């Protein structure tokens, strides 16, 4: 559900 | 990939990225790492993007299958979830092996050492997502230890707006919330990271401001989800 | 896949579809075909969806790399395009091998025989998209011959609104436009197919009407692109 | 560019 780092 | 030139592997990794062929990308960057030379900033990003996309697809598939399996509780759903799970663990083990042999020990600069330790935390986190046995606690502590070392270096050596410092704090906060069952730690870390970055934005160029605020927005999105 | 039950392979192909794991899907359906029994309507669709998604991703990657290669005219871009091209040809050869051993020869009903011949036309069309050598004309004629046999059967044995008949005509019209350099043949086929389907819609249930009109819209989209 | 059949 939560956002981790993404390019 | 032993017989391909390092520069050709890097060039082909960029081509595979353009073609959205991330398994190829990861194999090319694995070959480049195995040449034994340190990686540039750009090359580290290629390595990370490649394996994040490969394991990201496996994680998405594992969650679909795990959900089907939970709703069912023949052997097929469990068998196929296990197959996907084993392939994911293999990819995580490969990345961790590259970090351990020998990317981390040769990384002396803050930017490279923090980047690789963040990576080590992330791939242990992905192992933790599927772990259920004797070593699940040890897997969690391995993620925690790598993230913690990266945090300690980043706080001493990098400004609060540094994108790698921000992305590390973002992911360690997700670790706290999703893996360590420490939602208050997750929220506090995200808030303190956001607030100290906000107070340092005035020092940045327009381009650096854009980079930093983009990741701060991800911290904000999680805080909004969590509070 | 020789040691897995046919029913388990089919079940796992459905799971792989839900997980968007199309390479796994294709391997499971290849294993099911190799059990040697004929395929049901549902099973034929699973086979088709699996390989269409695998080769569709390869075709998309090949076009990205081919475009980069044309703009360049070292060896890396050509080498990597060739690698992707070879893997695509391998997938097409595998599907064609399944059709030839022995899906087509055992397919007696119009619905199955037309489905497999459409498939044979499509995978020769994909081979034609990348072909440049001595056999490119023969590859094109192999696609044409398979499509033509399927058309002849479909016109005698199926109503003009049958979705397989419509999808076959759609793809044979794309073959004419894109591969055979016969845009007038492509346009005439699309228009005649659309008009005869329109005149048969009155015979259909609401659900069949929805199936047929969805593919008619694809014929319309091409006519709008082409005229 | 043109549409072939898709599921
Ligand atoms: Ca060093
Ligand atoms: Ca038969
Ligand atoms: Mg397991
Ligand atoms: Mg070739």
mmCIF file with all atom_site columns, N, CA and C in Angstrom, chain B residues 20-86:
data_model
loop_
_atom_site.group_PDB
_atom_site.id
_atom_site.type_symbol
_atom_site.label_atom_id
_atom_site.label_alt_id
_atom_site.label_comp_id
_atom_site.label_asym_id
_atom_site.label_entity_id
_atom_site.label_seq_id
_atom_site.pdbx_PDB_ins_code
_atom_site.Cartn_x
_atom_site.Cartn_y
_atom_site.Cartn_z
_atom_site.occupancy
_atom_site.B_iso_or_equiv
_atom_site.pdbx_formal_charge
_atom_site.auth_seq_id
_atom_site.auth_comp_id
_atom_site.auth_asym_id
_atom_site.auth_atom_id
_atom_site.pdbx_PDB_model_num
ATOM 1   N N  . UNK B 1 20 ? 12.228 -1.536  -22.295 1.00 0.00 ? 20 UNK B N  1
ATOM 2   C CA . UNK B 1 20 ? 11.519 -2.087  -21.134 1.00 0.00 ? 20 UNK B CA 1
ATOM 3   C C  . UNK B 1 20 ? 11.780 -3.583  -20.982 1.00 0.00 ? 20 UNK B C  1
ATOM 4   N N  . UNK B 1 21 ? 13.011 -3.991  -21.288 1.00 0.00 ? 21 UNK B N  1
ATOM 5   C CA . UNK B 1 21 ? 13.439 -5.380  -21.138 1.00 0.00 ? 21 UNK B CA 1
ATOM 6   C C  . UNK B 1 21 ? 14.283 -5.477  -19.871 1.00 0.00 ? 21 UNK B C  1
ATOM 7   N N  . UNK B 1 22 ? 13.598 -5.495  -18.726 1.00 0.00 ? 22 UNK B N  1
ATOM 8   C CA . UNK B 1 22 ? 14.320 -5.311  -17.468 1.00 0.00 ? 22 UNK B CA 1
ATOM 9   C C  . UNK B 1 22 ? 15.086 -6.543  -17.031 1.00 0.00 ? 22 UNK B C  1
ATOM 10  N N  . UNK B 1 23 ? 14.635 -7.747  -17.400 1.00 0.00 ? 23 UNK B N  1
ATOM 11  C CA . UNK B 1 23 ? 15.446 -8.925  -17.105 1.00 0.00 ? 23 UNK B CA 1
ATOM 12  C C  . UNK B 1 23 ? 16.779 -8.864  -17.848 1.00 0.00 ? 23 UNK B C  1
ATOM 13  N N  . UNK B 1 24 ? 16.750 -8.503  -19.133 1.00 0.00 ? 24 UNK B N  1
ATOM 14  C CA . UNK B 1 24 ? 17.998 -8.284  -19.868 1.00 0.00 ? 24 UNK B CA 1
ATOM 15  C C  . UNK B 1 24 ? 18.840 -7.192  -19.212 1.00 0.00 ? 24 UNK B C  1
ATOM 16  N N  . UNK B 1 25 ? 18.211 -6.056  -18.906 1.00 0.00 ? 25 UNK B N  1
ATOM 17  C CA . UNK B 1 25 ? 18.914 -4.968  -18.224 1.00 0.00 ? 25 UNK B CA 1
ATOM 18  C C  . UNK B 1 25 ? 19.679 -5.475  -17.009 1.00 0.00 ? 25 UNK B C  1
ATOM 19  N N  . UNK B 1 26 ? 18.993 -6.244  -16.147 1.00 0.00 ? 26 UNK B N  1
ATOM 20  C CA . UNK B 1 26 ? 19.613 -6.730  -14.909 1.00 0.00 ? 26 UNK B CA 1
ATOM 21  C C  . UNK B 1 26 ? 20.785 -7.659  -15.207 1.00 0.00 ? 26 UNK B C  1
ATOM 22  N N  . UNK B 1 27 ? 20.636 -8.519  -16.215 1.00 0.00 ? 27 UNK B N  1
ATOM 23  C CA . UNK B 1 27 ? 21.726 -9.414  -16.579 1.00 0.00 ? 27 UNK B CA 1
ATOM 24  C C  . UNK B 1 27 ? 22.933 -8.638  -17.103 1.00 0.00 ? 27 UNK B C  1
ATOM 25  N N  . UNK B 1 28 ? 22.693 -7.597  -17.911 1.00 0.00 ? 28 UNK B N  1
ATOM 26  C CA . UNK B 1 28 ? 23.792 -6.767  -18.394 1.00 0.00 ? 28 UNK B CA 1
ATOM 27  C C  . UNK B 1 28 ? 24.483 -6.047  -17.231 1.00 0.00 ? 28 UNK B C  1
ATOM 28  N N  . UNK B 1 29 ? 23.705 -5.430  -16.323 1.00 0.00 ? 29 UNK B N  1
ATOM 29  C CA . UNK B 1 29 ? 24.341 -4.772  -15.171 1.00 0.00 ? 29 UNK B CA 1
ATOM 30  C C  . UNK B 1 29 ? 25.013 -5.755  -14.216 1.00 0.00 ? 29 UNK B C  1
ATOM 31  N N  . UNK B 1 30 ? 24.477 -6.968  -14.041 1.00 0.00 ? 30 UNK B N  1
ATOM 32  C CA . UNK B 1 30 ? 25.200 -7.973  -13.264 1.00 0.00 ? 30 UNK B CA 1
ATOM 33  C C  . UNK B 1 30 ? 26.561 -8.255  -13.896 1.00 0.00 ? 30 UNK B C  1
ATOM 34  N N  . UNK B 1 31 ? 26.583 -8.438  -15.225 1.00 0.00 ? 31 UNK B N  1
ATOM 35  C CA . UNK B 1 31 ? 27.851 -8.622  -15.925 1.00 0.00 ? 31 UNK B CA 1
ATOM 36  C C  . UNK B 1 31 ? 28.814 -7.462  -15.742 1.00 0.00 ? 31 UNK B C  1
ATOM 37  N N  . UNK B 1 32 ? 28.304 -6.222  -15.790 1.00 0.00 ? 32 UNK B N  1
ATOM 38  C CA . UNK B 1 32 ? 29.160 -5.053  -15.587 1.00 0.00 ? 32 UNK B CA 1
ATOM 39  C C  . UNK B 1 32 ? 29.758 -5.037  -14.178 1.00 0.00 ? 32 UNK B C  1
ATOM 40  N N  . UNK B 1 33 ? 28.932 -5.298  -13.163 1.00 0.00 ? 33 UNK B N  1
ATOM 41  C CA . UNK B 1 33 ? 29.440 -5.373  -11.793 1.00 0.00 ? 33 UNK B CA 1
ATOM 42  C C  . UNK B 1 33 ? 30.547 -6.418  -11.687 1.00 0.00 ? 33 UNK B C  1
ATOM 43  N N  . UNK B 1 34 ? 30.342 -7.585  -12.310 1.00 0.00 ? 34 UNK B N  1
ATOM 44  C CA . UNK B 1 34 ? 31.289 -8.689  -12.190 1.00 0.00 ? 34 UNK B CA 1
ATOM 45  C C  . UNK B 1 34 ? 32.600 -8.405  -12.904 1.00 0.00 ? 34 UNK B C  1
ATOM 46  N N  . UNK B 1 35 ? 32.691 -7.308  -13.661 1.00 0.00 ? 35 UNK B N  1
ATOM 47  C CA . UNK B 1 35 ? 33.996 -6.895  -14.165 1.00 0.00 ? 35 UNK B CA 1
ATOM 48  C C  . UNK B 1 35 ? 34.931 -6.447  -13.047 1.00 0.00 ? 35 UNK B C  1
ATOM 49  N N  . UNK B 1 36 ? 34.394 -6.114  -11.876 1.00 0.00 ? 36 UNK B N  1
ATOM 50  C CA . UNK B 1 36 ? 35.202 -5.855  -10.700 1.00 0.00 ? 36 UNK B CA 1
ATOM 51  C C  . UNK B 1 36 ? 35.559 -4.408  -10.454 1.00 0.00 ? 36 UNK B C  1
ATOM 52  N N  . UNK B 1 37 ? 35.249 -3.503  -11.378 1.00 0.00 ? 37 UNK B N  1
ATOM 53  C CA . UNK B 1 37 ? 35.487 -2.082  -11.178 1.00 0.00 ? 37 UNK B CA 1
ATOM 54  C C  . UNK B 1 37 ? 34.318 -1.450  -10.423 1.00 0.00 ? 37 UNK B C  1
ATOM 55  N N  . UNK B 1 38 ? 34.612 -0.373  -9.695  1.00 0.00 ? 38 UNK B N  1
ATOM 56  C CA . UNK B 1 38 ? 33.544 0.351   -9.016  1.00 0.00 ? 38 UNK B CA 1
ATOM 57  C C  . UNK B 1 38 ? 32.569 0.916   -10.056 1.00 0.00 ? 38 UNK B C  1
ATOM 58  N N  . UNK B 1 39 ? 31.354 1.232   -9.606  1.00 0.00 ? 39 UNK B N  1
ATOM 59  C CA . UNK B 1 39 ? 30.299 1.744   -10.474 1.00 0.00 ? 39 UNK B CA 1
ATOM 60  C C  . UNK B 1 39 ? 30.184 3.253   -10.304 1.00 0.00 ? 39 UNK B C  1
ATOM 61  N N  . UNK B 1 40 ? 29.999 3.966   -11.415 1.00 0.00 ? 40 UNK B N  1
ATOM 62  C CA . UNK B 1 40 ? 29.686 5.399   -11.359 1.00 0.00 ? 40 UNK B CA 1
ATOM 63  C C  . UNK B 1 40 ? 28.275 5.647   -10.832 1.00 0.00 ? 40 UNK B C  1
ATOM 64  N N  . UNK B 1 41 ? 27.943 6.914   -10.587 1.00 0.00 ? 41 UNK B N  1
ATOM 65  C CA . UNK B 1 41 ? 26.616 7.293   -10.112 1.00 0.00 ? 41 UNK B CA 1
ATOM 66  C C  . UNK B 1 41 ? 25.551 6.797   -11.104 1.00 0.00 ? 41 UNK B C  1
ATOM 67  N N  . UNK B 1 42 ? 25.771 7.074   -12.384 1.00 0.00 ? 42 UNK B N  1
ATOM 68  C CA . UNK B 1 42 ? 24.829 6.656   -13.427 1.00 0.00 ? 42 UNK B CA 1
ATOM 69  C C  . UNK B 1 42 ? 24.695 5.126   -13.470 1.00 0.00 ? 42 UNK B C  1
ATOM 70  N N  . UNK B 1 43 ? 25.835 4.445   -13.366 1.00 0.00 ? 43 UNK B N  1
ATOM 71  C CA . UNK B 1 43 ? 25.836 2.983   -13.430 1.00 0.00 ? 43 UNK B CA 1
ATOM 72  C C  . UNK B 1 43 ? 25.123 2.376   -12.225 1.00 0.00 ? 43 UNK B C  1
ATOM 73  N N  . UNK B 1 44 ? 25.296 2.975   -11.037 1.00 0.00 ? 44 UNK B N  1
ATOM 74  C CA . UNK B 1 44 ? 24.560 2.491   -9.871  1.00 0.00 ? 44 UNK B CA 1
ATOM 75  C C  . UNK B 1 44 ? 23.065 2.624   -10.091 1.00 0.00 ? 44 UNK B C  1
ATOM 76  N N  . UNK B 1 45 ? 22.640 3.742   -10.682 1.00 0.00 ? 45 UNK B N  1
ATOM 77  C CA . UNK B 1 45 ? 21.216 3.912   -10.960 1.00 0.00 ? 45 UNK B CA 1
ATOM 78  C C  . UNK B 1 45 ? 20.719 2.844   -11.924 1.00 0.00 ? 45 UNK B C  1
ATOM 79  N N  . UNK B 1 46 ? 21.525 2.486   -12.934 1.00 0.00 ? 46 UNK B N  1
ATOM 80  C CA . UNK B 1 46 ? 21.071 1.476   -13.889 1.00 0.00 ? 46 UNK B CA 1
ATOM 81  C C  . UNK B 1 46 ? 20.899 0.127   -13.209 1.00 0.00 ? 46 UNK B C  1
ATOM 82  N N  . UNK B 1 47 ? 21.864 -0.236  -12.365 1.00 0.00 ? 47 UNK B N  1
ATOM 83  C CA . UNK B 1 47 ? 21.781 -1.469  -11.592 1.00 0.00 ? 47 UNK B CA 1
ATOM 84  C C  . UNK B 1 47 ? 20.502 -1.508  -10.776 1.00 0.00 ? 47 UNK B C  1
ATOM 85  N N  . UNK B 1 48 ? 20.250 -0.430  -10.026 1.00 0.00 ? 48 UNK B N  1
ATOM 86  C CA . UNK B 1 48 ? 19.075 -0.344  -9.164  1.00 0.00 ? 48 UNK B CA 1
ATOM 87  C C  . UNK B 1 48 ? 17.774 -0.423  -9.961  1.00 0.00 ? 48 UNK B C  1
ATOM 88  N N  . UNK B 1 49 ? 17.644 0.391   -11.015 1.00 0.00 ? 49 UNK B N  1
ATOM 89  C CA . UNK B 1 49 ? 16.414 0.391   -11.824 1.00 0.00 ? 49 UNK B CA 1
ATOM 90  C C  . UNK B 1 49 ? 16.139 -1.001  -12.375 1.00 0.00 ? 49 UNK B C  1
ATOM 91  N N  . UNK B 1 50 ? 17.182 -1.670  -12.863 1.00 0.00 ? 50 UNK B N  1
ATOM 92  C CA . UNK B 1 50 ? 17.000 -2.983  -13.472 1.00 0.00 ? 50 UNK B CA 1
ATOM 93  C C  . UNK B 1 50 ? 16.416 -3.962  -12.468 1.00 0.00 ? 50 UNK B C  1
ATOM 94  N N  . UNK B 1 51 ? 17.075 -4.116  -11.325 1.00 0.00 ? 51 UNK B N  1
ATOM 95  C CA . UNK B 1 51 ? 16.613 -5.127  -10.388 1.00 0.00 ? 51 UNK B CA 1
ATOM 96  C C  . UNK B 1 51 ? 15.329 -4.701  -9.682  1.00 0.00 ? 51 UNK B C  1
ATOM 97  N N  . UNK B 1 52 ? 15.101 -3.393  -9.489  1.00 0.00 ? 52 UNK B N  1
ATOM 98  C CA . UNK B 1 52 ? 13.843 -2.962  -8.874  1.00 0.00 ? 52 UNK B CA 1
ATOM 99  C C  . UNK B 1 52 ? 12.657 -3.340  -9.751  1.00 0.00 ? 52 UNK B C  1
ATOM 100 N N  . UNK B 1 53 ? 12.810 -3.210  -11.070 1.00 0.00 ? 53 UNK B N  1
ATOM 101 C CA . UNK B 1 53 ? 11.733 -3.579  -11.978 1.00 0.00 ? 53 UNK B CA 1
ATOM 102 C C  . UNK B 1 53 ? 11.526 -5.086  -12.024 1.00 0.00 ? 53 UNK B C  1
ATOM 103 N N  . UNK B 1 54 ? 12.609 -5.870  -12.028 1.00 0.00 ? 54 UNK B N  1
ATOM 104 C CA . UNK B 1 54 ? 12.448 -7.330  -12.066 1.00 0.00 ? 54 UNK B CA 1
ATOM 105 C C  . UNK B 1 54 ? 11.739 -7.816  -10.810 1.00 0.00 ? 54 UNK B C  1
ATOM 106 N N  . UNK B 1 55 ? 12.280 -7.465  -9.641  1.00 0.00 ? 55 UNK B N  1
ATOM 107 C CA . UNK B 1 55 ? 11.694 -7.929  -8.391  1.00 0.00 ? 55 UNK B CA 1
ATOM 108 C C  . UNK B 1 55 ? 10.346 -7.265  -8.143  1.00 0.00 ? 55 UNK B C  1
ATOM 109 N N  . UNK B 1 56 ? 10.118 -6.070  -8.700  1.00 0.00 ? 56 UNK B N  1
ATOM 110 C CA . UNK B 1 56 ? 8.822  -5.433  -8.544  1.00 0.00 ? 56 UNK B CA 1
ATOM 111 C C  . UNK B 1 56 ? 7.714  -6.215  -9.224  1.00 0.00 ? 56 UNK B C  1
ATOM 112 N N  . UNK B 1 57 ? 7.984  -6.720  -10.429 1.00 0.00 ? 57 UNK B N  1
ATOM 113 C CA . UNK B 1 57 ? 7.027  -7.594  -11.090 1.00 0.00 ? 57 UNK B CA 1
ATOM 114 C C  . UNK B 1 57 ? 6.809  -8.906  -10.355 1.00 0.00 ? 57 UNK B C  1
ATOM 115 N N  . UNK B 1 58 ? 7.876  -9.480  -9.793  1.00 0.00 ? 58 UNK B N  1
ATOM 116 C CA . UNK B 1 58 ? 7.720  -10.713 -9.032  1.00 0.00 ? 58 UNK B CA 1
ATOM 117 C C  . UNK B 1 58 ? 6.914  -10.470 -7.765  1.00 0.00 ? 58 UNK B C  1
ATOM 118 N N  . UNK B 1 59 ? 7.168  -9.350  -7.080  1.00 0.00 ? 59 UNK B N  1
ATOM 119 C CA . UNK B 1 59 ? 6.404  -9.030  -5.874  1.00 0.00 ? 59 UNK B CA 1
ATOM 120 C C  . UNK B 1 59 ? 4.930  -8.840  -6.197  1.00 0.00 ? 59 UNK B C  1
ATOM 121 N N  . UNK B 1 60 ? 4.638  -8.165  -7.302  1.00 0.00 ? 60 UNK B N  1
ATOM 122 C CA . UNK B 1 60 ? 3.249  -7.970  -7.690  1.00 0.00 ? 60 UNK B CA 1
ATOM 123 C C  . UNK B 1 60 ? 2.580  -9.303  -7.978  1.00 0.00 ? 60 UNK B C  1
ATOM 124 N N  . UNK B 1 61 ? 3.279  -10.202 -8.681  1.00 0.00 ? 61 UNK B N  1
ATOM 125 C CA . UNK B 1 61 ? 2.716  -11.531 -8.951  1.00 0.00 ? 61 UNK B CA 1
ATOM 126 C C  . UNK B 1 61 ? 2.543  -12.338 -7.670  1.00 0.00 ? 61 UNK B C  1
ATOM 127 N N  . UNK B 1 62 ? 3.536  -12.292 -6.782  1.00 0.00 ? 62 UNK B N  1
ATOM 128 C CA . UNK B 1 62 ? 3.425  -13.016 -5.523  1.00 0.00 ? 62 UNK B CA 1
ATOM 129 C C  . UNK B 1 62 ? 2.206  -12.555 -4.727  1.00 0.00 ? 62 UNK B C  1
ATOM 130 N N  . UNK B 1 63 ? 1.927  -11.245 -4.712  1.00 0.00 ? 63 UNK B N  1
ATOM 131 C CA . UNK B 1 63 ? 0.775  -10.766 -3.945  1.00 0.00 ? 63 UNK B CA 1
ATOM 132 C C  . UNK B 1 63 ? -0.545 -11.213 -4.559  1.00 0.00 ? 63 UNK B C  1
ATOM 133 N N  . UNK B 1 64 ? -0.649 -11.214 -5.890  1.00 0.00 ? 64 UNK B N  1
ATOM 134 C CA . UNK B 1 64 ? -1.844 -11.766 -6.532  1.00 0.00 ? 64 UNK B CA 1
ATOM 135 C C  . UNK B 1 64 ? -2.048 -13.217 -6.106  1.00 0.00 ? 64 UNK B C  1
ATOM 136 N N  . UNK B 1 65 ? -0.994 -14.037 -6.206  1.00 0.00 ? 65 UNK B N  1
ATOM 137 C CA . UNK B 1 65 ? -1.125 -15.463 -5.908  1.00 0.00 ? 65 UNK B CA 1
ATOM 138 C C  . UNK B 1 65 ? -1.355 -15.711 -4.415  1.00 0.00 ? 65 UNK B C  1
ATOM 139 N N  . UNK B 1 66 ? -0.676 -14.948 -3.550  1.00 0.00 ? 66 UNK B N  1
ATOM 140 C CA . UNK B 1 66 ? -0.875 -15.098 -2.110  1.00 0.00 ? 66 UNK B CA 1
ATOM 141 C C  . UNK B 1 66 ? -2.321 -14.812 -1.724  1.00 0.00 ? 66 UNK B C  1
ATOM 142 N N  . UNK B 1 67 ? -2.924 -13.804 -2.352  1.00 0.00 ? 67 UNK B N  1
ATOM 143 C CA . UNK B 1 67 ? -4.317 -13.466 -2.090  1.00 0.00 ? 67 UNK B CA 1
ATOM 144 C C  . UNK B 1 67 ? -5.245 -14.592 -2.527  1.00 0.00 ? 67 UNK B C  1
ATOM 145 N N  . UNK B 1 68 ? -5.018 -15.132 -3.723  1.00 0.00 ? 68 UNK B N  1
ATOM 146 C CA . UNK B 1 68 ? -5.811 -16.277 -4.168  1.00 0.00 ? 68 UNK B CA 1
ATOM 147 C C  . UNK B 1 68 ? -5.645 -17.443 -3.201  1.00 0.00 ? 68 UNK B C  1
ATOM 148 N N  . UNK B 1 69 ? -4.414 -17.691 -2.764  1.00 0.00 ? 69 UNK B N  1
ATOM 149 C CA . UNK B 1 69 ? -4.150 -18.802 -1.858  1.00 0.00 ? 69 UNK B CA 1
ATOM 150 C C  . UNK B 1 69 ? -4.864 -18.623 -0.522  1.00 0.00 ? 69 UNK B C  1
ATOM 151 N N  . UNK B 1 70 ? -4.886 -17.394 0.004   1.00 0.00 ? 70 UNK B N  1
ATOM 152 C CA . UNK B 1 70 ? -5.569 -17.153 1.275   1.00 0.00 ? 70 UNK B CA 1
ATOM 153 C C  . UNK B 1 70 ? -7.073 -17.348 1.138   1.00 0.00 ? 70 UNK B C  1
ATOM 154 N N  . UNK B 1 71 ? -7.654 -16.899 0.025   1.00 0.00 ? 71 UNK B N  1
ATOM 155 C CA . UNK B 1 71 ? -9.081 -17.121 -0.189  1.00 0.00 ? 71 UNK B CA 1
ATOM 156 C C  . UNK B 1 71 ? -9.408 -18.608 -0.309  1.00 0.00 ? 71 UNK B C  1
ATOM 157 N N  . UNK B 1 72 ? -8.459 -19.423 -0.775  1.00 0.00 ? 72 UNK B N  1
ATOM 158 C CA . UNK B 1 72 ? -8.718 -20.853 -0.899  1.00 0.00 ? 72 UNK B CA 1
ATOM 159 C C  . UNK B 1 72 ? -8.668 -21.566 0.448   1.00 0.00 ? 72 UNK B C  1
ATOM 160 N N  . UNK B 1 73 ? -7.947 -21.012 1.418   1.00 0.00 ? 73 UNK B N  1
ATOM 161 C CA . UNK B 1 73 ? -7.817 -21.628 2.738   1.00 0.00 ? 73 UNK B CA 1
ATOM 162 C C  . UNK B 1 73 ? -8.854 -21.100 3.735   1.00 0.00 ? 73 UNK B C  1
ATOM 163 N N  . UNK B 1 74 ? -6.971 -28.088 -4.634  1.00 0.00 ? 74 UNK B N  1
ATOM 164 C CA . UNK B 1 74 ? -5.752 -28.857 -4.833  1.00 0.00 ? 74 UNK B CA 1
ATOM 165 C C  . UNK B 1 74 ? -4.496 -28.075 -4.500  1.00 0.00 ? 74 UNK B C  1
ATOM 166 N N  . UNK B 1 75 ? -3.330 -28.652 -4.795  1.00 0.00 ? 75 UNK B N  1
ATOM 167 C CA . UNK B 1 75 ? -2.067 -28.007 -4.425  1.00 0.00 ? 75 UNK B CA 1
ATOM 168 C C  . UNK B 1 75 ? -1.600 -26.916 -5.383  1.00 0.00 ? 75 UNK B C  1
ATOM 169 N N  . UNK B 1 76 ? -2.322 -26.650 -6.483  1.00 0.00 ? 76 UNK B N  1
ATOM 170 C CA . UNK B 1 76 ? -1.739 -25.863 -7.567  1.00 0.00 ? 76 UNK B CA 1
ATOM 171 C C  . UNK B 1 76 ? -1.465 -24.419 -7.155  1.00 0.00 ? 76 UNK B C  1
ATOM 172 N N  . UNK B 1 77 ? -2.393 -23.777 -6.445  1.00 0.00 ? 77 UNK B N  1
ATOM 173 C CA . UNK B 1 77 ? -2.175 -22.373 -6.096  1.00 0.00 ? 77 UNK B CA 1
ATOM 174 C C  . UNK B 1 77 ? -0.946 -22.239 -5.205  1.00 0.00 ? 77 UNK B C  1
ATOM 175 N N  . UNK B 1 78 ? -0.847 -23.095 -4.179  1.00 0.00 ? 78 UNK B N  1
ATOM 176 C CA . UNK B 1 78 ? 0.325  -23.077 -3.308  1.00 0.00 ? 78 UNK B CA 1
ATOM 177 C C  . UNK B 1 78 ? 1.592  -23.380 -4.092  1.00 0.00 ? 78 UNK B C  1
ATOM 178 N N  . UNK B 1 79 ? 1.546  -24.402 -4.953  1.00 0.00 ? 79 UNK B N  1
ATOM 179 C CA . UNK B 1 79 ? 2.727  -24.766 -5.732  1.00 0.00 ? 79 UNK B CA 1
ATOM 180 C C  . UNK B 1 79 ? 3.203  -23.603 -6.582  1.00 0.00 ? 79 UNK B C  1
ATOM 181 N N  . UNK B 1 80 ? 2.270  -22.911 -7.233  1.00 0.00 ? 80 UNK B N  1
ATOM 182 C CA . UNK B 1 80 ? 2.674  -21.850 -8.148  1.00 0.00 ? 80 UNK B CA 1
ATOM 183 C C  . UNK B 1 80 ? 3.132  -20.604 -7.380  1.00 0.00 ? 80 UNK B C  1
ATOM 184 N N  . UNK B 1 81 ? 2.461  -20.262 -6.271  1.00 0.00 ? 81 UNK B N  1
ATOM 185 C CA . UNK B 1 81 ? 2.972  -19.205 -5.395  1.00 0.00 ? 81 UNK B CA 1
ATOM 186 C C  . UNK B 1 81 ? 4.399  -19.507 -4.935  1.00 0.00 ? 81 UNK B C  1
ATOM 187 N N  . UNK B 1 82 ? 4.654  -20.757 -4.538  1.00 0.00 ? 82 UNK B N  1
ATOM 188 C CA . UNK B 1 82 ? 5.986  -21.175 -4.110  1.00 0.00 ? 82 UNK B CA 1
ATOM 189 C C  . UNK B 1 82 ? 7.008  -21.014 -5.231  1.00 0.00 ? 82 UNK B C  1
ATOM 190 N N  . UNK B 1 83 ? 6.620  -21.336 -6.464  1.00 0.00 ? 83 UNK B N  1
ATOM 191 C CA . UNK B 1 83 ? 7.535  -21.185 -7.593  1.00 0.00 ? 83 UNK B CA 1
ATOM 192 C C  . UNK B 1 83 ? 7.910  -19.724 -7.788  1.00 0.00 ? 83 UNK B C  1
ATOM 193 N N  . UNK B 1 84 ? 6.911  -18.844 -7.788  1.00 0.00 ? 84 UNK B N  1
ATOM 194 C CA . UNK B 1 84 ? 7.176  -17.414 -7.945  1.00 0.00 ? 84 UNK B CA 1
ATOM 195 C C  . UNK B 1 84 ? 8.011  -16.910 -6.778  1.00 0.00 ? 84 UNK B C  1
ATOM 196 N N  . UNK B 1 85 ? 7.671  -17.360 -5.564  1.00 0.00 ? 85 UNK B N  1
ATOM 197 C CA . UNK B 1 85 ? 8.403  -16.981 -4.364  1.00 0.00 ? 85 UNK B CA 1
ATOM 198 C C  . UNK B 1 85 ? 9.870  -17.395 -4.448  1.00 0.00 ? 85 UNK B C  1
ATOM 199 N N  . UNK B 1 86 ? 10.129 -18.611 -4.928  1.00 0.00 ? 86 UNK B N  1
ATOM 200 C CA . UNK B 1 86 ? 11.505 -19.076 -5.053  1.00 0.00 ? 86 UNK B CA 1
ATOM 201 C C  . UNK B 1 86 ? 12.272 -18.260 -6.084  1.00 0.00 ? 86 UNK B C  1
#
